[PDB]
Amino acid sequence: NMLPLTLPNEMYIASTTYEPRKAIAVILNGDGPKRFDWVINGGTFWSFHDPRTSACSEIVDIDQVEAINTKELALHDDIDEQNRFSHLLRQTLRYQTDSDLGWDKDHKALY
Amino acid sequence: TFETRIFDEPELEFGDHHHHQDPRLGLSEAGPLQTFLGDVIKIGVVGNSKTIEDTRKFIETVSSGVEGKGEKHPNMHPPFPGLGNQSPYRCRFEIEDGATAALTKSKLDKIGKEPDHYRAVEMAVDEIIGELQAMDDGGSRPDVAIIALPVKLLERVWNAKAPNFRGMLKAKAMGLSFPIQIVWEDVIDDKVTIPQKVKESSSRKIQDIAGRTWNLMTSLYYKGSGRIPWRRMPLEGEFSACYVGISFYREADGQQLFTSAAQMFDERGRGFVLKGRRARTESRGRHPYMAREDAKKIIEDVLAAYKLHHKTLPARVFILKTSRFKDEEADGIIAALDEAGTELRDLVWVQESYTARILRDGNYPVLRGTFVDLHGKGLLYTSGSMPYYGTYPGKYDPNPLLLCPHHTSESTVAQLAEEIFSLTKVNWNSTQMNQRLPIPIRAARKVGEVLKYVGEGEVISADYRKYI
Amino acid sequence: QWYLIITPTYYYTTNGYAPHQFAAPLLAGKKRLDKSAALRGQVIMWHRFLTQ
DNA sequence: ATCGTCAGCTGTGCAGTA
RNA sequence: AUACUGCACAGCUGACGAU
Numbered sequence: 001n002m003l004p005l006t007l008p009n010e011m012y013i014a015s016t017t018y019e020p021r022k023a024i025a026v027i028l029n030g031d032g033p034k035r036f037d038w039v040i041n042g043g044t045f046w047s048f049h050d051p052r053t054s055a056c057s058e059i060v061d062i063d064q065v066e067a068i069n070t071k072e073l074a075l076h077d078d079i080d081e082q083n084r085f086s087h088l089l090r091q092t093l094r095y096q097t098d099s100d101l102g103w104d105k106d107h108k109a110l111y
Numbered sequence: 112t113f114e115t116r117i118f119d120e121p122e123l124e125f126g127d128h129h130h131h132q133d134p135r136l137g138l139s140e141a142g143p144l145q146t147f148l149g150d151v152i153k154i155g156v157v158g159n160s161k162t163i164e165d166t167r168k169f170i171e172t173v174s175s176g177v178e179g180k181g182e183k184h185p186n187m188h189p190p191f192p193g194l195g196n197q198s199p200y201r202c203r204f205e206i207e208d209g210a211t212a213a214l215t216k217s218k219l220d221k222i223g224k225e226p227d228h229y230r231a232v233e234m235a236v237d238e239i240i241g242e243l244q245a246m247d248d249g250g251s252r253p254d255v256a257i258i259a260l261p262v263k264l265l266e267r268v269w270n271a272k273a274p275n276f277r278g279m280l281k282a283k284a285m286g287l288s289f290p291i292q293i294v295w296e297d298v299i300d301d302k303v304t305i306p307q308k309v310k311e312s313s314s315r316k317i318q319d320i321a322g323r324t325w326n327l328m329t330s331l332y333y334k335g336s337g338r339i340p341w342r343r344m345p346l347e348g349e350f351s352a353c354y355v356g357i358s359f360y361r362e363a364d365g366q367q368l369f370t371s372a373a374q375m376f377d378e379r380g381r382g383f384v385l386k387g388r389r390a391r392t393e394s395r396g397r398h399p400y401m402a403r404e405d406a407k408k409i410i411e412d413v414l415a416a417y418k419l420h421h422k423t424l425p426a427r428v429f430i431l432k433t434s435r436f437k438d439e440e441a442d443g444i445i446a447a448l449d450e451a452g453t454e455l456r457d458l459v460w461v462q463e464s465y466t467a468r469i470l471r472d473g474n475y476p477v478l479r480g481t482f483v484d485l486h487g488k489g490l491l492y493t494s495g496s497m498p499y500y501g502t503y504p505g506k507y508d509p510n511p512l513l514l515c516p517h518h519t520s521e522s523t524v525a526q527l528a529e530e531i532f533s534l535t536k537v538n539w540n541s542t543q544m545n546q547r548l549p550i551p552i553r554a555a556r557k558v559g560e561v562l563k564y565v566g567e568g569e570v571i572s573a574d575y576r577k578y579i
Numbered sequence: 580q581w582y583l584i585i586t587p588t589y590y591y592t593t594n595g596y597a598p599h600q601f602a603a604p605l606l607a608g609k610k611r612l613d614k615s616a617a618l619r620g621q622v623i624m625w626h627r628f629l630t631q
Numbered sequence: 632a633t634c635g636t637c638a639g640c641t642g643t644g645c646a647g648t649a
Numbered sequence: 650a651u652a653c654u655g656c657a658c659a660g661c662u663g664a665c666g667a668u
């Protein structure tokens with residue numbers, strides 16, 4: 001039951017810092033379009049590009065984009081970075097999911 | 112694509128080098144590996160008079176013989192070949208008069224409508240322990256004592272009306288000379304009904320009249336004779352080994368953690384040694400895993416036991432654990448093994464909470480013994496369809512195990528998997544073949560399940576006949 | 580080579596989008612009568628869901 | 632002071648004997 | 650607690666971010 005993945009090429013990194021989890025929550029209520037594929041680590045955005053034409057410039061703020069290929073990101077043998085990478089993959093799985101809903105709070109399901 | 116293997120069904124060794132892979136048929140054909148030197152085994156029964164009469168009728172009924180259950184599956188339901196000239200154990204069971212106690216109705220009434228859920232269990236366990244103590248101090252001591260619990264007694268110590276009755280019973284009965292065995296009044300007659308715990312609409316379910324005996328008499332023979340019925344078949348040209356099992360348990364109140372160990376190793380002649388320990392190593396933290404000095408102590412005690420028995424040191428110190436090996440645990444284990452002077456060693460984490468599964472097409476699941484090498488880890492199936500039984504004895508997709516070594520073992524995967532698949536059928540508490548866990552984990556769990564209730568400053572024994 | 584593992588399961592609602600108070604025992608009742616042939620089909624169905 | 636992610640470990644009860 | 654398998658639920662441990 002295993003399934004391979006193929007990751008995209010470019011990764012976009014920002015340096016916004018004045019945005020805790022509560023701030024990004026209260027800005028994703030009033031965000032307009034819903035993409036929901038970002039994470040918060042403190043001082044980093046750590047998302048899969050789309051930093052301007054996604055109604056997310058309220059947190060991007062046209063920051064200094066650090067264009068780095070994802071091939072070096074998966075090789076980063078660190079547990080703390082691996083958990084955040086798995087978080088980003090999980091949140092990107094939450095895209096293409098509003099058409100099939102699911103994932104209430106606890107069962108980690110996709111009904 | 113990964114590389115897969117299919118392991119054969121392991122064979123046991125009964126008396127007179129009989130081979131075979133089924134405990135029931137091998138016991139019916141050649142008998143136990145260690146034959147009893149006597150002819151009769153004395154049994155003592157404790158309970159009210161209805162339970163004693165039911166137990167006596169039960170043994171006299173099963174002495175003649177019980178036929179099988181079904182005809183479609185002959186091997187899965189073999190008939191019990193009597194208890195007589197054609198007994199599978201080559202011995203007789205005899206309940207001697209005078210080695211039998213009784214409990215009055217008023218005394219059970221005192222343990223009846225009585226408040227609190229700790230006092231009543233205390234009175235029941237101390238009355239039973241005192242009765243067994245008075246029996247043991249006389250001249251009619253049996254070899255194994257059967258506790259036949261009445262239906263009424265279940266409603267105050269087990270159902271509804273909170274410690275474990277069995278745990279305190281075994282803990283208080285640890286200081287005796289004979290082991291005990293507990294039945295539940297529905298194994299001895301098929302006319303009674305015991306309700307469930309939370310919902311009273313349903314009731315308990317019992318296996319079969321022929322299925323009860325094949326386990327009960329085997330366990331009774333092991334407990335009352337002390338001789339092992341069967342054992343695993345050794346190969347030719349393998350190194351001398353010694354298996355250790357580690358587990359953790361929490362106490363009744365406080366949710367701190369402890370550590371239990373099991374100390375299997377083989378014997379010089381035709382035997383098998385399986386025993387616990389004689390100490391408990393503190394309560395250092397409520398986390399899982401273990402410290403370094405405790406690992407040093409465990410390894411030292413295991414090597415001391417092997418040196419005491421074989422007058423030498425083993426060549427393999429195979430270690431199994433239910434949790435991931437931290438750095439300090441491995442450091443202590445390696446330091447103890449290097450100071451002792453042993454060259455071969457394996458440390459394996461056995462994991463049950465994995466999600467990868469093997470799917471085939473058809474109405475039946477994968478065969479018992481399929482192994483898949485997942486890039487260093489190992490997926491092993493110890494349950495599923497078997498050709499000997501002629502079906503799959505389950506109700507859902509079986510649950511595989513994940514084996515992972517801690518990067519310093521001296522042997523490759525698909526050999527540790529073979530040894531673990533060999534070590535699963537040795538269990539003298541059941542006669543089935545669909546057991547999943549190997550014995551070094553189950554022994555430690557069963558040891559801890561009774562070691563929970565031993566008070567501070569008491570004595571403990573390494574006997575395995577007082578934990579099952 | 581990031582890998583995804585899928586494990587089929589069921590979710591019960593009263594009607595539409597609402598939790599059920601008796602949601603625990605239906606899972607056991609559905610899993611008890613299942614065979615070992617529907618799981619593989621559900622897995623390849625999920626793969627076809629994700630691929631398409 | 633608890634809230635989010637990631638990997639885990641134990642207890643306490645049923646159904647079903649294929 | 651004659652037995653094993655399968656399922657369900659409840660707890661509480663570590664690594665990371667701030668209020």
Ligand SMILES: [Mg+2]
Pocket residue numbers: 330540579
């Ligand atoms: Mg037993």
